[PDB]
Amino acid sequence: RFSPYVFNGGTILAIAGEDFAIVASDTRLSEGFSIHTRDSPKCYKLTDKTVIGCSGFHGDCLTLTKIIEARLKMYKHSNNKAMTTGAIAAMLSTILYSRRFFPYYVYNIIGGLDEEGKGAVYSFDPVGSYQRDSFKAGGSASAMLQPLLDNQVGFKNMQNVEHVPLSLDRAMRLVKDVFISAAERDVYTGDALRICIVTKEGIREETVSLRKD
Template sequence: MRRGATTKLLGIQSHFFFPVMRGETVTSASIFNPHEYIGGTLVAIAGNDFATIACDTRLTNDFNIRKMRSQSKLFDVSPQTVLGSVGCWCDTLALLSLVRSFSLKYELDNLMPVCPDSLASMLTRTKLTRQYFVSTVVTGIDSNGLGAVYFNDPIGNYLRLPYHISGTGGRIILPTLNWFEGNEEDHMNAITTSLTVDKTVQISMEAFRAARDCDSFTGN
């Protein structure tokens, strides 16, 4: 006899089967799930010739705090590229190892540091062939000298966006960015013409102030 089960994490449903002995009762607590969602929030904003990305530093499992104010979710990949990741922490570390190797090989082959465009493309190819239960945001300066923000979801889709919020605090933070209004072209025009570094830093700080009181995964 086999008992079926379905799990859902980061919007992905996984179906699997496991044997059930005669007379055995299976509960949800007896199902092993190797992917642990540790929460967290990322806010990335692209400017005309710069990009900013901010994160919280708390690792949690439900309401159990593993580390507080000590673990960044941002990783320097090259002088012009930063990777942010939220989701399953062990998958984040495994993916980061691949990113480090790719960055080194890219620099040796092209005699230049990896740019956000190339890293986002690499993450898409990797996630299409392997399951990593993380959402990643790549920020930095692209090959044309413009600020760039790329979002990669857990199944490999990616978009270039003027700004992006990932993680558990996204729904709380989004109203803070309501001044981005209009259609897609207006978004890009607002980003490239009116933002300064100081303004984006201020926006990011206000966003996390809004999230810290309502989202236990983000904290203070």
Template sequence: MSMYMPGATAVGITFDNGVVFASEKRIAYGNFLVSKTTKKTFSLTDQVGTAIAGLVADMQILVLQIKALAKIRKMELKRDIPPNSIAKMMSNLMYERRFFPLLTQVIVGGVVDKPAIYTLDPLGSVLPDEYAAVGTGAEMALGVLDQQYKPGMKEKEATDLAIKSIRAATMRDSFSGDGIDVLVITKEGTKEFTEKL
């Protein structure tokens, strides 16, 4: 059985002091370009973010539900929710919907104690990693990441590498393109910016 996954490319990288997420902005469905300005990187809490590839509606509903659940959990525990807990919340939500899955591939991560990222498939498997790529351009992005990632990178190096890997994917994947959204999360907080291709 093959599942139709709309195109996109998103990456996540850990560095010495936090995590960086990057994704391109194009939404294509078949050979039709639907949008050139779609956001696929999201801040979930002050210390946790996500980059997602897949169906936009599924992506948006997942982010809304997880943001709400994380807020409730934070009020219950009276402390920041670590990335592994948010990854588990996402996993549970996606697994509950396994017969009508959310057609998304997710990279979620952040920094509470130390930087961490996790990859989730549409059924909710949680795989920890130091860097990851999802979507139709993932192979091209991983080609760059595998070669150039090193543990303990500085923020600028990791950000530049994330942008470079998305650029590589957009050169060969017709479903990816139209600019790059970047989200950087450190203990000090989050910053977001957009890069042109």
């Protein structure tokens, strides 16, 4: 019959550093076996220190982005200060549960700085749980990306491999390599890779292309 949902796909990555939060995402918006476009960035700049990415069903992503921006403006016009990261996480969990019985088909990843100046990535689920993790990969290429970050960032399952803190440009070559390697086998990985970096000095962006397949 009328089906209310459709899978647009997309791939969002996040890495929490010592003083930085890198969020990157492909820009292909597709449906089934077609391409609607090759430029649609999943990242969104909420505050000066918070970037959210939203993949899955696209209309719910747009709606959720606009509602989050509205409630940000409501918090600002009530309390003379911007929200934190964890405040946005709690509010988003309340929103994602507030349509429990007609759910959003949306994966959500919030990166940003905490109030101490440290990296914090809050993952989500379509129904409204969250947790403070160091790295997550959401969307269609999640399973192609989580074990490799477990290998490089988490240092899991290795022997006599010391724990080095993750630097910046090392994280950059990581993000570029994982998107190339995931774009080899995925059908939903875009061309344009939109990398957002949140530092203690503002928001940087960076556009790196891929193979045009």
